[PDB]
Amino acid sequence: SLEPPPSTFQPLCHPLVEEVSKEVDGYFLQHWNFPNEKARKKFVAAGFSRVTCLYFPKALDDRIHFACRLLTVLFLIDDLLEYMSFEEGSAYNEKLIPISRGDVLPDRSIPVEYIIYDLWESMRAHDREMADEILEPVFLFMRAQTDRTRARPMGLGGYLEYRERDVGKELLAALMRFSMGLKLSPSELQRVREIDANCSKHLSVVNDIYSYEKELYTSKTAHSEGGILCTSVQILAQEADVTAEAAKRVLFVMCREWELRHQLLVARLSAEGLETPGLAAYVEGLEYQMSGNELWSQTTLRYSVV
């Protein structure tokens, strides 16, 4: 009942996905405290490093693991917060922020704390400038996750606006630039803000589409606010008074419109003499994120489960 409408975007996968997914995953299964075997198995099932390689297929060969580690740990935390109140979730996230900047050593007895620490240390050690560029976008993401807006009345327009942060658009962009060693100037970024905003809705909604059942479930099982159902699928379903599945099919078509928009905005940037080689590398990178994201969402067992 969810045949993806046609797209001109073809995703790519990083050639070293096999290797990277091996180390990363082993690492977490080794240091991350698992509730039980049933959890560590589902962990391996989600395929977090394959998402990373799907998202950043053109990443440099020695930087793709950094990306798989950060997204993995963020996913792991992402779920943890669902059983917490906005207040608890916020405190959990806030203690990790100083640790991410490396201003507070981690309680080595708490995996989430030293994992976060080592990871960011590893990245700064590899490339400080770019590493540091990911810090505030990650912090932006983290604070959106438990933001009070999560409960206030919100239509499609306002939701897409809040989702940009909660989906971590900026974090992914900076992660992509870091991983590809793609440096852009403070004026090259400004030139692509419409492109980034457009891409953020696409990532967000495609994810909302496939993660709806999972969220509907934790909605009825997790914490009252932590697992609050906040998604475009529910919003559009209610606004149009159709089923969630109908909403998915309409939202999917809308995503294609954002894809067209992406192509149009890029041609625009290219039309006016503004498309620099770095930007070309970037905008094409965003496309990979949108297609990679969709492909993973269509397959991962993280979205096909109880």
Residue ranges for the binding site for Mg(2+)? 78, 207, 211, 215
Nearest alpha carbon to residue 59 among 266, 284, 274, 263: 284
Q: Which two tokens stand for residue 237?
A: 């379903």
- Whichever of 20 and 255 has its CB closer to its own copies, that residue is 255
- For the annotated binding site, the residues are 78, 207, 211, 215, 302-303
Window of 123-131, 156-164, 206-214, 217-225 that interacts with its own copies by CB under 8 A:
156-164
Q: Is 244 in the site for its own copies (CB under 8 A)?
A: no
**Which listed residue (27, 28, 43, 55) is catalytic?**
55
Cα 105–Cα 44–Cα 171 angle in degrees, nearest 5: 50
Contact 15/58 with Cβ under 8 angstroms?
no
CA Rg value for the chain: 19
Q: Is 158 in the site for its own copies (CB under 8 A)?
A: yes
| Binder of residue 201, out of Mg ion, its own copies, none (CB less than 5 to 8 A by kind) | its own copies
Q: Which of 6, 153, 277, 306: binder of its own copies (CB under 8 A)?
A: 153
- Whichever of 98 and 181 has its CB closer to its own copies, that residue is 98
- Amino acid type, 186: P
Q: How many residues bind its own copies (CB under 8 A)?
A: 47
73 vs 272: CA distance, rounded Å: 40
- Whichever of 229 and 250 has its CB closer to Mg ion, that residue is 229
Window of 29-37, 77-85, 115-123, 144-152 that interacts with its own copies by CB under 8 A:
144-152
Cα 193–Cα 50–Cα 6 angle in degrees, nearest 5: 60
- The greatest distance separating any two alpha carbons of the chain, rounded to the nearest whole angstrom, comes to 56
Instruction: State the sign of the Cα–Cα–Cα–Cα dihedral 98, 99, 104, 110.
Output: positive
Contact 171/138 with Cβ under 8 angstroms?
yes
49 vs 174: CA distance, rounded Å: 17
Q: Is 253 in the site for its own copies (CB under 8 A)?
A: yes
Query: Quick one: residue 121, left, alpha or beta (phi over 0 = left, psi -120 to 50 = alpha)?
Result: alpha
Q: Is 144 in the site for its own copies (CB under 8 A)?
A: no
Q: Which of 33, 257, 270, 301: binder of its own copies (CB under 8 A)?
A: 257
**Which listed residue (27, 159, 169, 210) is catalytic?**
169
**Interacting residue ranges for Mg ion, rule: CB under 5 A:** 78, 207, 211
Which sequence positions are flagged as catalytic? 55, 75, 141, 169, 296
User: Which positions lie near its own copies, rule CB under 8 A?
Assistant: 90, 94, 97-98, 101, 103, 139, 143, 147-158, 160-161, 164, 186-187, 190, 193, 197-198, 201, 235-236, 238-243, 246, 249-250, 253-254, 257-258, 260-261
